Amino acid sequence: IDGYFKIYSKHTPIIGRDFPQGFSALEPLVDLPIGINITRFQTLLALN
Amino acid sequence: KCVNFNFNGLTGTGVLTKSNKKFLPFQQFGRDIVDTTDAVRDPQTLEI
Amino acid sequence: ANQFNSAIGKIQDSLFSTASALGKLQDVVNHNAQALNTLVKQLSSKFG
Ligand SMILES: *[C@@H]1O[C@H](CO)[C@@H](O[C@@H]2O[C@H](CO)[C@@H](O)[C@H](O)[C@H]2NC(C)=O)[C@H](O)[C@H]1NC(C)=O
Ligand SMILES: *[C@@H]1O[C@H](CO)[C@@H](O)[C@H](O)[C@H]1NC(C)=O
After folding, report:
1. CA torsion, points C29, C32, C34, C37, in degrees to nearest 10?
2. Phi, psi angles (nearest 5°) of residue C37
3. Bridge partners, residue A5, by sequence
4. Are B4 and B12 in contact, with CB atoms under 8 Å apart?
């Protein structure tokens, strides 16, 4: 938004196996004013 | 004491007393239900 | 006298539990408080 890259993250402990039912807000971590154009991404997977 | 303050571009006039409201690590200043400035965090010592 | 005592003894029940009545004073208080809050909230408006 307005040329800023905002990061919101949260590390919720897991009670169960996958996607437990519950609510948890995502507190912002770092705001970075880059101001570029973003349309695509690709996650990186570690290879050992 | 009744003084005028300017906190990171937030200005106003009033008295400043020690509070007990616990801000989140990122929240800067607090507002009321009627949406008026009520509590601010000191930018230097992170005091509320 | 017994009928009146029995009738007056049920006043403290039907006044609150049945709702119905006793809402006009609450409506007055709520309306005045809401008008005050709406008047105060208008200060944050831009009006262009
Ligand atoms: C802004 O700089 C001041 C310089 O004093 C920092 O104040 C110090 O903060 C540390 C860490 O909390 C304390 O141990 C020192 O006692 C403080 N010094 C004084 C003189 O009060 C302050 O923390 C800095 N603010 C930020 C957000 O980094
Ligand atoms: C990138 O977004 C900016 C923002 O205005 C614009 O100037 C530019 O034309 C956009 N480029 C592309 C390839 O979408």
Report:
1. -120
2. -65, -40
3. A32
4. yes
Ligand nearest to the CA of A34: 2
**C-alpha–C-alpha distance, residues B23 and A27, integer Å:** 12
- Mutation target to probe the B interface, by most B beta carbons within 10 A, among A24, A27, A30 is A27
Resolution in A: 3.3
Which residues, in sequence order, are CB contacts of A45 under 8 Å at separation 6+?
none
- Give me the residue label for tokens 């906190």: B7
- Specify the experimental method: cryo-EM
Taking alpha carbons only, the member of B26, B36, B28, B33 closest to residue B7 is: B28
B48 near B35, Cβ under 8 Å? Answer: no
Q: Round to the nearest angstrom and report the end-to-end CA distance of chain C.
A: 70
Tokens of A30: 């770092």
Q: Which ligand is nearest to the CA of B25?
A: 1
